[PDB]
């Protein structure tokens, strides 16, 4: 296979030019995930203005569908660098994708939008409310999942062949099927990192401290920033 061959010479090349790197333990990966010489800057927002105005702001992978010059304007540096207007160019004369991929990527984000616009708002009541911050689950999930079992649930969805019976037992069976049927257009070698993020956010039941006038359901927690305050409260049906 061509794609399987695409994992061999890279392995041989890595084992050749980096011999001591491979000699390390596999558990060392958790350490050198973030091995970088660059100092952790105190304020990255200061140089954004200069970086955007800098010529060739974007680092892009080598590509052929983006011309070197478009309408008398350079785009790529011919990895190569990209002009600031390259993302604007791709928004009008770029290569499209399947509608299923768009729906899958926007999934767990369109759900929040649909929940916002499918709920009715009561009249705003003004009074001397006392908002006490209580830890509640921030975002609604497709299926309730016990924490510390979320990683085991994600393994079944994405790499069920590289798992253990122990992981299989303590995984939420019932949310794997829902995740598989909505993530399968993006469970490829590309967007593998991304699809995990959407899947994790779909079943993440983390607790956040939010203002509370009445006990919050998961639906009202994600929008608690305007439901209640020191002086106002709006009821949701």
């Amino acid at each position: 296979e061509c794609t399987l061959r695409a994992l061999v010479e890279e392995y041989n090349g890595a084992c050749k030019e980096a011999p001591k790197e491979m000699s390390k333990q596999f558990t060392d990966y958790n350490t050198f995930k973030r091995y970088t010489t660059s100092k952790k800057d105190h304020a990255p927002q200061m140089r954004l203005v200069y970086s955007v105005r800098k010529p060739w702001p974007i680092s892009m992978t080598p590509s052929k569908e983006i011309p070197l010059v478009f309408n008398g304007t350079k785009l790529k540096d011919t990895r190569t660098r990209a002009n600031i207007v390259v993302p604007d160019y791709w928004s009008k004369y770029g290569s499209q994708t399947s509608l299923e991929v768009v729906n899958a990527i926007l999934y767990a984000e369109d759900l929040k939008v649909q929940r916002f616009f499918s709920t009715e708002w009561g009249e705003i009541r003004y009074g001397r409310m006392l908002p006490f911050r209580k830890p509640v689950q921030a975002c609604p999930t497709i299926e309730e999942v016990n924490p510390a079992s979320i990683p085991h649930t994600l393994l079944q969805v994405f790499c069920p062949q590289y798992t253990t019976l122990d992981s299989k037992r303590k995984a939420h069976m019932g949310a794997v099927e829902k995740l598989k049927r909505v993530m399968e257009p993006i469970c490829k070698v590309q967007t593998q990192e991304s699809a995990v993020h959407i899947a994790r956010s779909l079943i993440d039941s983390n607790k956040k401290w939010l203002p509370t006038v009445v006990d919050h359901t998961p639906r009202t927690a994600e929008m608690a920033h305007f439901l209640c305050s020191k002086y106002h409260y709006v009821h949701t049906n």
């Binding site: 392995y11 558990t27 350490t31 050198f32 970088t36 927002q45 207007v85 908002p131 994600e222 920033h225």
Partner: protein, 647 residues
């Protein structure tokens, strides 16, 4: 100031947020930190005796003192050993579930801790390169040093790392290899002892700049162990400043025929009056009454003994002026106000047995204060975080309240806490107070931020910058620091800054290119009208535009394409989520990046869980690559040809 103090329709507590210097430049510390470091080091020695005697305190090993030596009219450094013993025992007898959870953490979670978490720390001093390096680089070089000088492979667990450190401390000679770094037991001991000092930057609310110290990577594993145990104790006690507690005490009500007072205060020289041996005694009492083995006690006591032998770096010299000239001179060369400490100078470092440093043991100090609180006749509600505290007294008599307040001050003095008299205020009928930037007035607790939200894009890319700015504003609203009007105004200011930062305002190259090529502005970073509102902070930018019809389907297919050359943060991947941008360290960096790149493709599971999988990286990669090849449902001959090339 009278303008900040209303007398009607609003109370001064709510307007006390006006006494804050937001939107102004934070003070920055210039030049040498040597004077500040030396002053911090010398405070505990001047405070040990009621009459200052630095020389007689410079030969004290353990800061144990008699009750008569304690200074009740001024700061007092040191502790009373019997007091610490009894107070720790009392703190153990109370809060049984917290110590049970500590036992559970020791038996179960402690052996499972991995030293890879040490990679997530902040800047460290490298004893090999004699520079400051990020935590991952220092951790990698320290592990390599242990590998070379110890002739065995360090296990992934933190206890294995600590045992490796303890074993390498037993060697007469250690090397690092070309470099060929030559070491010694005394040299390595000094490297372990040395604390790297630096200025505390971007600090507000103080007239004078402070310094913060970092431990070496050799001792950071032990420090993390003890601090993790401290977290597990503190998260399960009602007197800690970690959840709420202030609001709970504010909501507490007392019957009319009672005297309730509220003492709000800080601690003067909190890190300049604490002795690590008191922490040793506290931890030893805790572990001994928990039934832990002797190796647990040894492991917990090592960090504080290494701290007792600290060699805090004394900056880069004191300032000396001849005429208009200026020079930097190390302590000892010429007379100064710190001559008493000249005998303690070891190279560019100075030995210091008494006193702590900021940012070293933030939670063990809180634990020491909390055990100091535990007393028979202190029947109040205490909440303390580091050097800030609030106390609620519920007494039947004003004299009883004053007796309890003085008893509180003295019992904190028993271990060297020393509340600042000028910064401590006791309101008699209670109901008004301050704690950790939270102002309590009449059962309302209002949160006031020390720092205003930046209201600027973070600097990664338009999508994540917009998402993070909206999330920051939403968090500020949730904490109560912002409301409807402030939230919307902050959103408008952030929108203006965000549009300006990405050339979405006025006439720029980006807008000109969009206009010439007839590319309509469809996103906020493209110059379009904002779609986000106050109620829409959590919603994504790409979404809520397709829903509202502002983005038709084919442009979504064009910009959501994963095959685009350019590609909590809940922002969908898009073409606008781009990226903008030591002799033998860059090549090692790129080699590690390539090794990480071959992984995450053959090993999807590391994207969900940790690496685990004991064994060498090369062997694990080879085995997994094989498993993939002969699980590819291809022909057997093709599989044989593919494995023939794996070498």
């Amino acid at each position: 100031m009278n303008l900040f103090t209303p007398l009607s329709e609003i109370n001064p507590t709510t307007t006390q947020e006006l006494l804050y210097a937001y939107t102004g430049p934070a003070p920055v510390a210039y030049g040498t930190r040597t004077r500040a470091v030396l002053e911090n080091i010398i405070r505990p020695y001047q405070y040990f005796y009621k009459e200052p005697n630095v020389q007689r305190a410079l030969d004290i090993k353990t800061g144990c003192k008699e009750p008569e030596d304690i200074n009740v009219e001024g700061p007092s450094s040191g502790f009373h050993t019997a007091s610490v013993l009894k107070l720790a025992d009392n703190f153990f007898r109370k809060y049984r579930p917290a110590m049970e959870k500590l036992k559970y953490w020791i038996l179960v979670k402690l052996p499972k801790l991995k030293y890879a978490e040490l990679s997530k720390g902040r800047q460290t001093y490298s004893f090999i390169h004699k520079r400051n390096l990020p935590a991952p680089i220092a951790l990698e070089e320290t592990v390599e040093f242990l590998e070379q000088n110890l002739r065995r492979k360090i296990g992934p667990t933190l206890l294995s790392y600590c045992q490796a450190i303890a074993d390498v401390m037993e060697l007469d000679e250690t090397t690092y290899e070309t470099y060929t770094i030559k070491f010694s037991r005394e040299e390595l001991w000094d490297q372990m002892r040395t604390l790297n000092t630096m200025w505390k930057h971007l600090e507000r609310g103080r007239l004078n700049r402070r310094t913060i110290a970092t431990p070496s990577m050799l001792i950071r594993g032990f420090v993390k162990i003890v601090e993790d145990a401290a977290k597990e104790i503190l998260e399960n006690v009602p007197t800690s400043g970690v959840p709420e507690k202030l609001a709970k005490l504010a909501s507490k009500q007392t019957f009319h025929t009672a005297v309730t007072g509220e003492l709000s205060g800080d601690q003067e020289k909190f890190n300049e009056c604490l002795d690590p041996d008191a922490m040793r005694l506290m931890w030893t009492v805790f572990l001994r009454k928990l039934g832990c083995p002797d190796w647990i006690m040894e492991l917990f006591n090592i960090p504080f003994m290494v701290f007792k032998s600290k060699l805090a770096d004394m900056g880069e010299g004191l300032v000396y002026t001849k005429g208009k000239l200026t020079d930097r001179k190390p302590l000892g060369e010429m007379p100064s106000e710190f001559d008493d400490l000249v005998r303690n100078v070891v190279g560019n470092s100075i030995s210091c047995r008494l006193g702590m440093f900021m940012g070293m043991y933030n939670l063990t100090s809180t634990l020491l204060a909390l055990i100091s609180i535990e007393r028979e006749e202190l029947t109040g509600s205490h909440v303390e975080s580091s050097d800030d505290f609030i106390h609620f007294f519920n007494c039947k008599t004003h004299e009883e309240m004053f007796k309890q307040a003085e008893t509180l001050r003295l019992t904190l003095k028993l271990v060297g806490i020393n509340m600042s008299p000028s910064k401590c205020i006791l309101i008699s009928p209670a109901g008004i107070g301050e704690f950790n930037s939270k102002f309590h007035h009449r059962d309302f607790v209002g949160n006031v931020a020390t720092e205003l939200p930046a209201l600027v894009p973070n600097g990664t890319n338009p999508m994540t910058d917009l998402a993070m700015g909206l999330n920051v504003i939403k968090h500020s609203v949730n904490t109560g620091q912002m409301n409807l009007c402030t939230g919307a105004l902050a959103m408008r200011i952030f929108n203006h800054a965000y549009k300006y930062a990405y050339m979405a305002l006025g006439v720029t190259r980006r807008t000109r290119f969009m206009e010439e090529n007839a590319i309509t502005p469809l996103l906020t970073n493209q110059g379009a009208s904002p779609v986000h509102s106050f109620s829409t902070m959590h919603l994504d930018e790409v979404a809520l535009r397709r829903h509202l019809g502002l983005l038709d389907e084919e442009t979504l297919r064009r910009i959501l394409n994963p095959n685009n050359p350019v590609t909590e943060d809940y922002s969908v991947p898009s073409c606008f989520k781009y990226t903008l941008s030591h002799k033998a360290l860059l090549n090692k960096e790129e080699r590690y990046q390539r090794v990480t790149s071959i992984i995450n493709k053959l090993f999807p599971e590391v994207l969900i869980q940790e690496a685990s999988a004991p064994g060498t990286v090369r062997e694990s990669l080879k085995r997994r690559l094989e498993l993939v090849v002969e699980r590819s449902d291809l022909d057997e001959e093709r599989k044989k040809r593919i494995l023939s090339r794996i070498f």
